[PDB]
Write a protein that binds this DNA or RNA. Sequence first.
RNA 1: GCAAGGCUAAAACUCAAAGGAAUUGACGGGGGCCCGCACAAGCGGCGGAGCAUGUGGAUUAAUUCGAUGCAACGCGAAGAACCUUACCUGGGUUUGACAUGCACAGGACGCGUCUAGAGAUAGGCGUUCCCUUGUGGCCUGUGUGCAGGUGGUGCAUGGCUGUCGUCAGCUCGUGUCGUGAGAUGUUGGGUUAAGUCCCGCAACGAGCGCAACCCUUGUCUCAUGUUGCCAGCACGUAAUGGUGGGGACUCGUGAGAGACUGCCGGGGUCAACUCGGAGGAAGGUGGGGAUGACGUCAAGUCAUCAUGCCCCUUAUGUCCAGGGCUUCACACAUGCUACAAUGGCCGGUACAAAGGGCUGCGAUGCCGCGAGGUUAAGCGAAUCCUUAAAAGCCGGUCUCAGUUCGGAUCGGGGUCUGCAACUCGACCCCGUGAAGUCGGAGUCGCUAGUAAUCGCAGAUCAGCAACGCUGCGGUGAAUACGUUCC
Lengths: 207, 60, 50, 152
Amino acid sequence: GQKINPHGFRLGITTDWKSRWYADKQYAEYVKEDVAIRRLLSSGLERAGIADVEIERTRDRVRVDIHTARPGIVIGRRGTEADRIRADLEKLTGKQVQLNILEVKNPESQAQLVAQGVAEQLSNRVAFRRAMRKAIQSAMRQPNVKGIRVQCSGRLGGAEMSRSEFYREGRVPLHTLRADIDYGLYEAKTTFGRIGVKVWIYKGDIV
Amino acid sequence: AKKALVNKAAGKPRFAVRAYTRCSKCGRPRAVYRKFGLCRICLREMAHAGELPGVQKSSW
Amino acid sequence: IRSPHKYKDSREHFEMRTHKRLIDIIDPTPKTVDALMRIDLPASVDVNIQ
Amino acid sequence: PRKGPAPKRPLVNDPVYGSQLVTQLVNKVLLKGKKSLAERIVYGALEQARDKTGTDPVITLKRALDNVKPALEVRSRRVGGATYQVPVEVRPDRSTTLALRWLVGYSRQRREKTMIERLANEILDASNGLGASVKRREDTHKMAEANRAFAH
RNA sequence: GCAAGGCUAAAACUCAAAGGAAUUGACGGGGGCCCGCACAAGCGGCGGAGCAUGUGGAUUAAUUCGAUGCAACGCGAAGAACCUUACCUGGGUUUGACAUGCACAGGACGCGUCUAGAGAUAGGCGUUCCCUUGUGGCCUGUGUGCAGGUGGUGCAUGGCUGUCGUCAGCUCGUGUCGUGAGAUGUUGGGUUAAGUCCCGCAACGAGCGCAACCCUUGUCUCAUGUUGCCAGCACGUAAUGGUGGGGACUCGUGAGAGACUGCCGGGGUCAACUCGGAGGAAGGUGGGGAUGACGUCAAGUCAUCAUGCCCCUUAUGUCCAGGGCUUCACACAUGCUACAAUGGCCGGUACAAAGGGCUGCGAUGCCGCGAGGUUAAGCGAAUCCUUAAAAGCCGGUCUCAGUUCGGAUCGGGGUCUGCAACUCGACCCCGUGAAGUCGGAGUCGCUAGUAAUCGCAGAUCAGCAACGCUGCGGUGAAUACGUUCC
Ligand SMILES: [Mg+2]
Ligand SMILES: [Mg+2]
Ligand SMILES: [Mg+2]
Ligand SMILES: [Mg+2]
Ligand SMILES: [Mg+2]
Ligand SMILES: [Mg+2]
Ligand SMILES: [Mg+2]
Ligand SMILES: [Mg+2]
Ligand SMILES: [Mg+2]
Ligand SMILES: [Mg+2]
Ligand SMILES: [Mg+2]
Ligand SMILES: [Mg+2]
Ligand SMILES: [Mg+2]
Ligand SMILES: [Mg+2]
Ligand SMILES: [Mg+2]
Ligand SMILES: [Mg+2]
Ligand SMILES: [Mg+2]
Ligand SMILES: [Mg+2]
Ligand SMILES: [Mg+2]
Ligand SMILES: [Mg+2]
Ligand SMILES: [Mg+2]
Ligand SMILES: [Mg+2]
Ligand SMILES: [Mg+2]
Ligand SMILES: [Mg+2]
Ligand SMILES: [Mg+2]
Ligand SMILES: [Mg+2]
Ligand SMILES: [Mg+2]
Ligand SMILES: [Mg+2]
Ligand SMILES: [Mg+2]
Ligand SMILES: [Mg+2]
Ligand SMILES: [Zn+2]
């Protein structure tokens, strides 16, 4: 409640937009369409581990790009689940949909995936102090990771008082603009409520 | 907001002057921008996430 | 307003820029207009023909 | 402030009368950014002074200022269970500033109609040593005199 | 023992501690050093009046809910006439306004008419497509799992935010000292805006913070020339760069240069660094913005959203019409307009920036005193409209008066938006012309393009914003001795 969003801070400097198009009059309903698309692709695909969704709209033609560590699940029974999802998107928009799953190289140095895995362990009742440490070690064993910070906050294991601990390895210069800091946020749905999990991954300054 | 109110707003009301805008994402009735159709909150989170092309923090 | 409730004095500004150029006056040669219409460009840039 | 003195700003000579005294006067009369109006008021006052006395207006103004400039002020201080006035010397530029402030402030509350003639009358009375501006300097000097005991 | 009293000296009962050293913090009307519109020096206000807005209280059928020292009170609300709306009265419905599972049946749906305040209900029509041949879509009706809840708990929570405070601190690894909590590093001497840096040292290194990278403003170079510019020619309509044209100037927008104590003098352990010069558009962080460490306040939010438990299910769900959220013996808070001559009114006239516009902006013309009405060129826009900036300058008048100040209140008549202007909209015209003559104790902001003052634009938006908010430009000051006091 005091730190700025790391992505928003550098948006337009280092990080880039996840939606690309130009629309003067058709801006509001493009936004309304994209939010519905994002609800759809967030529902049911949690097992698939979605990293980030990028949306491309090119003069009445929509190109949706999804990134995950396990494209086999999103495709399904060799092109059946993918076809069903594309049919859902077609029914949603009315415009012909081009759906693409590419790959996620390293779901160990990728925030919003590290965070999702940690939240999965919390939901499965693993000790948080162990899940956080294993995630941090897995991330620091990656090619280009100059540091990582992982923060969990909530009732943290059935406690009554909610608290917040965080661990840190390497260096994570949040205030620096020339940095390349990936951000990830996910919530674990434990039996006692929700638990927020935040991950900051620093991957060196710039190209 | 309540789903009954969200459906009522989405519908076509009697006396077209009665039509009002709600947030396209959360259903907030107040502080909804016409160009996005979002409330100020949902606008802020979407802009930080980068899901709104052309929008970015402003310094001058 | 940054907060979801009651903190009016804390705010945040956002822009939205639009860049405009290339009002060029190319000749309406039928073989040139061929290339003009068969070329397709990024969607992030909007192009209009007058 | 705490980190020593601050740089003061310089002024330029007045075109019609090549002095900075009348520039300080217009800056004392100026309100709400109406510098042209303040210049008009000051110029009219100087012209009325010239047309009533014959003498050069800036010379009359310098005489009035010499009459109303103080030498000792009475800055207040608290020591024990009582607070009492302490007479201190006045530096020259502060004396000129204070004299101009006194002239304009007392002319603003004279019983006449327009500020031009109010200020002209105040300047003439000060140059003659009669006005409330001179009375103020005399009262200041008397209070600085009646407290020489506390000259620590 | 003269006395005061001294000496020897219990118990009941009662408590689960009472204590000694030392550690980390916090605090002191302890000490040293340093800083901040903190004071001082100035300028302008608020507290007094009228009105706008929010709040307490009171009232009411309801005056929905939240915020409550700084850090609640022009706050959530960037727009309460219906709608919004979550509240009241009454009229309805109750697998529901909305999604799916399980069991039947076959049109759903749309159009129009009546009754009704409306919700809804009935008169009658278009129709069962898809092969309701079977699968399909859809729907009713019956139900049944349910859906729904702005119902509770912010002291169960996520997320988001304020605040101390843009204050300069907060820590870790190894090593060393101590039985231990811990300490050291992070202390000492200088220096800085800075835990900024240098010199020493049982510490050596590191991290988040500081600074820097980002945006904007300030100078120049190169590229560029339309819808932008107009120097040199023609053209000069009409002077409206209007036209041919030009690459000169500006400007527009791209890439660069430039500021680093870089150079010089003095100081300083020759170090950090400091004082003063040169050259430069700019000189020591050039001005401004974005950026909020570890944490604190069980700070704020279950009414953005999400959510664990609890609660309602012919109602605490849902639909509708009127009403309320706009009350008013009072109190507080933030503002606007004033109390006038540095002014009011009238006439003429000059100089901006930043933005908005197809369910839109309306140039021109005609009508109207005016708000406005009508026609309609152009314009998704450096080309059209918005577009007349106002203070300013010149002239005339008023002559110190509760006024030719002030513009509340009230009477009459209108315009527009909207199904609708009573409760409860803005604006215009005629009349009306209140308090108020500078404001007690007290209290607030501001150190330069600042304060003070003058207009313009946007968001929300049918209308309500020329008193709020977020911005833009115009004019443009006075002071700072200094750290005794708060
Ligand atoms: Mg409306
Ligand atoms: Mg002790
Ligand atoms: Mg102390
Ligand atoms: Mg003071
Ligand atoms: Mg006052
Ligand atoms: Mg008052
Ligand atoms: Mg209330
Ligand atoms: Mg306040
Ligand atoms: Mg305010
Ligand atoms: Mg209502
Ligand atoms: Mg709380
Ligand atoms: Mg410390
Ligand atoms: Mg220590
Ligand atoms: Mg440091
Ligand atoms: Mg910084
Ligand atoms: Mg609390
Ligand atoms: Mg509360
Ligand atoms: Mg909720
Ligand atoms: Mg609830
Ligand atoms: Mg109603
Ligand atoms: Mg209200
Ligand atoms: Mg008048
Ligand atoms: Mg006039
Ligand atoms: Mg007329
Ligand atoms: Mg009058
Ligand atoms: Mg009276
Ligand atoms: Mg008077
Ligand atoms: Mg007073
Ligand atoms: Mg409006
Ligand atoms: Mg106001
Ligand atoms: Zn929203």
